[PDB]
Design a protein around this ligand. Structure first.
Ligand SMILES: [Cl-]
Lengths: 154, 112, 106, 156, 153, 153, 106, 150, 108, 154, 151, 107, 108
């Protein structure tokens, strides 16, 4: 059964916990939404109507000890548009979790570093938004809403 | 069991909006080739609902689930709605269906 | 938790009957769209148990509870059984699961 | 933690009213000495027979009121069947009872009355038949105490 | 016809167009009489020795309560091959009108149901009978308000 | 003798010579108590686990109508080995004396019967007891008017 | 009478710690599915306590008894607390409850 | 005349080791039906909301082992009455190197969470952290929490 | 000890009234959680006596004492009666019992 | 009223005196404890939190004569860990119950032999400890604290 | 996943046949937070209250006629008093009769456990020792051990 | 057994090549900081095998296993060859061992 | 849409075989007069595929559905493929089309 209608293109997808080493976006979980025309194609959100949208995403990175000094974690929301068919970054962040260190004599030092991105944009019909990370081997989608990604038509 | 239409019996009020969700259980069927058919109570003809305007379709290929939210409900939108999808593997090609009924009750227009 | 599977560990003898009960705690899931899945110990296939014959399903919409009694138990029915339901309120659509293991000794 | 320790079959049901229902008769199975197993499903306060055969159908209801607001009150209790073969509600067992004997407590104050009604019989039922235990006055139900109102079937 | 058979059973219902009579019928919707149980002279004839469940309900209705002081009885009787005397297996008594001919209010229909049930060991050729003392107050109008039956347990 | 037959069964009847008390008897004509059901302290002891059919009827009869609104009860209780507390499985209450407490005379017998029946799961050693609150209104005269029994379905 | 919650009324001061004990009297209910519920004075919601952190649960299946110790008490922890359990024998499935109220003064 | 339920609460600076939400402060909001009950925001109407909160952690040194700074927004709903996390994040502030008998090095680590969710009438939101002893409520708008029905 | 049943042997007549008294000597047990159990002579089941009707219970929290008066005695009320209490201090929670026998003869 | 606030997972369980010839552990008795998270599943204690514990247990054996000389008395504390899923003994002791003279005639000689075990160990989340004996037919739980078993979070 | 305080639980080496040697790098054994293992001696790293315990299991396959005396002592040498003194000790005679002889079979096992709380200072060297290390049974696991823990 | 040597008792005349596998069962042991030992004709003591050389070591942290391929097989000695690893969780530090027999004849 | 071309987006490798299926939804179009067209990306010529060799066609007149399996795929066979059919009922004569794109990637 259903209740009050509600509208606007909406999306809040959560990572698949059962995906091992990859970022699969899901909507068929408790506090996730995907309605009113928003399509999730090849792990990509397709805008159903032209207007102003709010884009957000969080990624949580965890590693058990620091192997490399030159470890860089990235997270970007990209857009390939119908008018300009090249994927361009709308929101981006870079984070270095390890300042040298490289534990020689130690007992593993688990690090946690989250990254959050958000912005308002004008999108056109058929544009594909994509949230991507460079190292999907450090994703920590364990307990809950630690990794997510969504748009909402404002 | 090969497409699972979830809201089997729905009863909404005139002027509202019902969503029907269908989940693909055959991993060879495509969420790109989805079809919708409604059959109005008492008549024998399956008409194909077109994707646009009042009939909004939400698809997620990741979980292979698609839905059909219908707005502006009238009393002429009472019937059996089914979803469909086109499957294709090797040398095999087939299609799949579901099932779910809608009844819309009138508003009665209060007279002073 | 959303859906509460009660007999989490059952151990029966060949030729008997195990009952697994699930109770809904989320009022958006329907007692109408219930599903059962077993994954036999050692295999990577979660099969969907079908309702008919040896697999009996009892449903009560009032208590939002369903059960699954399995009769004529053999030694090939050793695995993990989960229950499932389809939930829907407004713009939200999801499904819910449980957990519980069965071992049959001959 | 414990385990089951008896095997048994034949569809059975003995559902009892919900005490926390106030003015309605909602059937429950998740209570101490109540049963609903071996295939019987309870949908809209209705029992759906899972297999064709001969059943024993029974139900009891307890009516209680603390005064008669009229001398013409009628209490009824019926078990009905809508079948797949004939999709019309027909009464299988029925009973009527008149609770107030020329009173409508007029010359004196209120007075608590109790009146039960019991139904039972054997019938042949088919798969998908929907049986319903029904009463016309659900505001006089006394499901406070123990097994005072109940409803059940058992496959013989 | 699609499914198997079971065991001696009977569920007979009163005839609605039989005024002042408790005529039991079996060729009527939702009524049974099969696997050897015979309905002869308003009596069920046991086809095999064993344990049976005997039950019957009667509905009494009147359209006024005089102070006649009427006692309503309902009994299931048994005449056995071993002891050829009618003995009651199940019985109940009920007084429907505890008044002194209500003067002011007219009609005021009273309804009283009575149910009997129990398990007994019966032999071949036993004839069970459901009877009422005052068939002049019987309400055999609507469905399943009067019935009588056995089932081989 | 004749047919073997099994299934734990019991149909016990009231003692007619039991003043102000409900004493259950088993060795009287068309009454049964065999195949493991034993009768302890006015209680039936279930001999094996399974599904049983439980029933009891009591007939209350009185000559007067004192104490405004008197309440007559009849309940079947179960004390199980798993949970050692007396709990009611089937119960019913009935008010026999309508508001109007007679003023003027002293003779007018009322009759009220009460019947209970249901299916329950009983285990080894469960002790069922059928009881009433007023053993001074018992009608243990006549035939099968007060009884109590179980049978394994 | 199926589960005996022993501390029926406690009055503690802000900062302290209350322990609530429940003992199973029916040998068919399992200590593997124990549940805790609080209803805060002034709310119409029975909330389910999650087993972890401030809420520690100790169970002994031999005695069919479980406990719930709550530490770091505030005045927001004043309400009626109940315990619960899942029972299953033959064809029967039921649940059990108790009762007991808590008030914390600041 | 602006409708739509809204809330933007900020921590109490003069609160001893605790995260107490305030609404009668300069740049804070709590109006159009959202109530702040037992340090929780109560959603007044069903619809789509934007939920966000930020917390700032400060410490004067890295003690023993690792500290985990967590920041989570939870929802206990009328439909499913158990506290479940909508948004969560974890951060380890200390990259080992605990002060080896030298002097301290104050670390700052903030955590931000935000997202859109469907809430029903009577749902109770709460923004919470595990170590209220590392809260830095010294300045204004360093820790805050709010919703708006979009 | 921790609980003392006072009348260890009682012998009453059909139609009488027996009182069994228990005094708590452990100051951690609560007179609020009192329990009574009967085991009829010859039976191997301890049943739980339900406080109500024929069973009247009198308790005093100050002296940690409770009693159990039984009215309308029959011959079916003859057995070993025990009292019980739920004790709980800091981290400790336990229970305590007693013992005391009743035999009832008929009036004939 | 529990006036004393206290913490650290602790347990001191005693054998069931009314349990024929079996070792069933009890906590709802006089001076015995089971609190702050320690669970008793199947005569097994479940560690509620990772840390350093002190483990101890005593068993007292009594028999009414030595008929045969084939009797070896054991008392062992075993551990099943999440990291290594095999039961290994943490503390063990063996004792010869009947030195010699195997009572030939006019036996009537109740013999008593106690065994005590104790030590400090590191336990993890979910570790299941169990105190076990070889012949639970020689258990003497007739008195008071003659058989017991416990852990304490130090 | 933190730590605690000075602790030790060392067990005899099974592959040292006929000798008592305490090891720390072995399954379910501890020696951390400052406690040192010298020449079969534990060095207390801090002044305070400690719990000292040890168990030994003696096993023999025969009973001699010398009235065997099995001893087990935990000793302490302090910086304040430079002499070996017993803190905990026990003696036990395992063989009562006059050797198996007629029925040559005496598989006997006898354990001894010691425990107590003491105030120890920095640099104190504790040692658990036995008088007859030829009957030591380190055949199974955790049957012989010795440890301290800072209370 | 915490460490599982699969290839054990064998008699391989001088000249052969086959890996001896050890599998870690304790999840606290590391695939790194590992060392290998072979006996001395099974008469005296075990030798400490050095790095590389005539000995082959295969390590994979994913499978928590290390191996020893017997290359350049001459007659060095017989006996039981053991693998070992350094394990350490929190306040605990311990090690694990193995075992497996090889017998070498000549032409 | 009268006639439904099912595989809308395809990506196969050099040396493979793609099957393109079309189902008629207009009950007036015939499976006897079916047509196939290929249009290479970057070309403005819609070419007519001939039925034979690499082009195998499967037809079912009962289901009014036909398919086109294409074998020995090269990298020059990347383009938009359409199916067609000619319908006729009364005084009516028309044709129908679909839509679906192919991309093939090379190898070394
Ligand atoms: Cl547009």
């Amino acid at each position: 059964s259903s209740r009050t209608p509600s509208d606007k293109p909406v999306a809040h997808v959560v990572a698949n916990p059962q995906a091992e080493g990859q970022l699969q976006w899901l909507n068929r979980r408790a506090n996730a939404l995907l309605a009113n025309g928003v399509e999730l194609r090849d792990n990509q959100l397709v805008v159903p109507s032209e207007g102003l949208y709010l884009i957000y995403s969080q990624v949580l990175f965890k590693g058990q000890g620091c192997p490399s000094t030159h470890v860089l974690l990235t997270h970007t929301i990209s857009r390939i548009a119908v008018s300009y068919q090249t994927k361009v970054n709308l929101l981006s962040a870079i984070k270095s979790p390890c300042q040298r260190e490289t534990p020689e004599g130690a007992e593993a030092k688990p690090w946690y570093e989250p990254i959050y991105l958000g912005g308002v944009f004008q999108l056109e019909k058929g544009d594909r938004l994509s949230a991507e990370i460079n190292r999907p081997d450090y994703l920590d989608f364990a307990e809950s809403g630690q990794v997510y990604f969504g748009i909402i038509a404002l | 069991a090969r497409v699972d239409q979830t809201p089997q019996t729905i009863t909404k009020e005139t002027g509202e909006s019902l969503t029907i969700n269908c989940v693909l259980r055959d991993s060879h069927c495509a969420t790109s080739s989805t079809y919708w058919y409604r059959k109005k109570s008492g008549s024998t003809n399956e008409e194909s609902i077109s994707k646009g305007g009042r009939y909004v379709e939400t698809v997620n290929s990741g979980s292979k689930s698609f839905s059909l939210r219908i707005n502006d409900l009238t009393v002429e939108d009472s019937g059996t709605y089914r979803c469909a999808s086109e499957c294709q593997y090797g040398l095999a090609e087939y299609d799949v269906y579901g099932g779910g009924t809608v009844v819309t009750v009138n508003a009665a227009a209060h007279h002073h």
